[PDB]
Each structure stands twice: as structure tokens, then as C-alpha cells.
Amino acid sequence: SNPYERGPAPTESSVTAVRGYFDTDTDTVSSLVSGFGGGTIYYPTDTSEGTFGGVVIAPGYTASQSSMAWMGHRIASQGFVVFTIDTITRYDQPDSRGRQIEAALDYLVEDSDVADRVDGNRLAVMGHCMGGGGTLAAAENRPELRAAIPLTPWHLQKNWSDVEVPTMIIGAENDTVASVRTHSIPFYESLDEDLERAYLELDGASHFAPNISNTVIAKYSISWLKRFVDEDERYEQFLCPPPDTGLFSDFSDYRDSCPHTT
Numbered sequence: 001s002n003p004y005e006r007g008p009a010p011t012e013s014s015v016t017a018v019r020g021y022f023d024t025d026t027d028t029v030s031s032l033v034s035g036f037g038g039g040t041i042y043y044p045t046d047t048s049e050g051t052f053g054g055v056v057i058a059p060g061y062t063a064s065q066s067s068m069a070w071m072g073h074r075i076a077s078q079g080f081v082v083f084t085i086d087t088i089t090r091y092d093q094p095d096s097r098g099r100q101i102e103a104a105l106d107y108l109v110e111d112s113d114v115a116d117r118v119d120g121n122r123l124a125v126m127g128h129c130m131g132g133g134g135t136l137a138a139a140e141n142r143p144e145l146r147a148a149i150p151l152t153p154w155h156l157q158k159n160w161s162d163v164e165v166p167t168m169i170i171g172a173e174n175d176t177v178a179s180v181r182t183h184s185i186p187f188y189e190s191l192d193e194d195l196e197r198a199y200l201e202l203d204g205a206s207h208f209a210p211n212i213s214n215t216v217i218a219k220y221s222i223s224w225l226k227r228f229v230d231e232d233e234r235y236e237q238f239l240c241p242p243p244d245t246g247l248f249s250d251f252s253d254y255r256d257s258c259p260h261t262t
């Protein structure tokens with residue numbers, strides 16, 4: 001048996017739902033905290049199935065946690081402790097966001113009021129824009145992390161052959177801020193060929209698609225966290241085989257490393 005499995009067997013409707021199996025509540029973290037700008041922790045109230053994996057979500061350039069807030073209850077209700085952080089300033093660069101993401105991971109595991117609900121050996125990182133660049137930076141610096149999901153990422157550093165964390169990059173086809181040609185795709189193609197990974201390109205989507213309720217982003221983010229943070233093979237079904245990318249699909253592109261071994 002897998003000791004990290006949480007919640008009932010998934011279905012298409014359960015993984016795409018606005019709220020999962022687990023009721024959640026929130027805890028507010030002050031900006032007084034050292035190393036980042038604080039934020040909000042979304043967590044499951046039910047302790048009976050054990051501790052959960054932890055997830056830090058960073059925002060983009062000029063943005064705050066309010067742009068990522070919808071992912072809080074949505075991911076957390078599937079069985080995760082999700083920490084939507086603010087940065088120190090709204091204009092911090094990607095590598096600074098990386099270090100702030102790292103400090104938030106440590107805060108979550110060591111200092112937070114819900115530390116006893118987090119398994120500190122099973123952590124993940126997500127981020128938008130420059131926060132997605134920071135996601136990669138954090139992943140590169142901490143190979144023990146279980147998953148990384150950069151959302152429409154931006155970073156001048158194009159080479160991430162170093163990264164050993166299973167990463168799902170979600171790009172937006174029509175992104176003009178962090179063009180997929182010059183950001184997302186270079187990042188993905190640089191990833192090691194033996195690294196479990198995925199590139200998801202949303203058809204007709206804008207740079208700010210990750211900042212609004214999106215069933216596609218939610219489904220695949222959830223499925224990726226389940227598969228690697230929880231090593232949950234029950235969610236393999238939503239990642240493999242990969243979705244269609246032809247006419248009338250939500251994906252303009254999809255690149256995979258199926259099957260997923262952990």
C-alpha cells in the first residue's frame with residue numbers, strides 16, 4: 001500500500017471539481033515573517049487520514065497572493081497544505097522569488113500553526129510569471145522537492161538541465177509577456193530526458209489565464225501533485241495517456257514522459 005494516498009478513488013468530475021473531498025480552513029501568515037512577504041495557508045481540517053504534502057505557490061511580477069488565491073481551497077480540498085505567499089516587494093526578480101519560495105517552504109514545515117499537518121519530506125512548488133521562474137530556481141536548488149509547476153513562467157535563465165524535480169510547465173499559447181517560444185518551451189526542452197516532466201500549452205490562452213478559475217490548470221496541477229507529492233498512481237490515469245491536441249482541444253500542445261515511475 002501507498003502510505004501517502006489521501007481521499008477516495010478519483011473520477012473526472014472529482015478532479016475537475018471546484019472543491020474536493022476535504023473541507024478546508026485558512027491561516028493567515030504576517031509579512032513580519034523572515035524571508036518573504038507572508039501569505040495564506042489553506043489546509044484540510046480532517047487529520048484522520050494522516051499528514052499531507054505541502055505546496056508553496058508564488059505570484060507574478062507586480063502581483064500578490066490575490067492573483068493565486070483561487071488555487072488555495074481548490075488544490076487543498078484535494079488533500080494538500082497550500083501556501084499562497086506574497087513576495088517582499090511586487091517587483092522582485094525570479095531568483096529572489098526562488099529564495100523566498102524556499103524560505104516559505106521552511107516556514108510552513110518549521111514555524112506555521114499547521115506544521116503538524118505537513119509532511120516536510122513531501123513538498124512542491126508552483127508559481128506564476130516571475131514566480132514560475134522562481135519555481136524553477138527553487139527546484140534547481142532543492143532536488144528533494146517532489147514536484148514543480150511553473151505557470152506561464154518568465155526567466156532570463158533558459159537552461160534547467162540541472163533540475164531533478166518532476167516539473168510540469170503550463171504555458172499559454174498566446175502569451176505576449178512571457179512568450180512560450182522564448183520562455184516556457186526553452187525551459188522544457190532543456191530538462192533532462194530522463195526527468196519525469198510535461199509541457200502543457202493552453203490553446204488561445206493569455207498570460208493571465210493562471211490568475212482566474214481554470215478547470216484545465218486545476219485538473220492537471222492536482223493530478224501532478226497527487227502523482228509525485230503523494231506518489232499516487234490513482235491519478236496516473238489523468239496524465240497518461242496524454243490529452244489530444246488537435247481541433248477543438250483545450251491544448252495547442254502537450255509533451256509527456258509517460259509512463260510515470262517514482
Ligand SMILES: [Ca+2]
Nearest residue numbers: 257258259260
Ligand atoms: Ca517515464
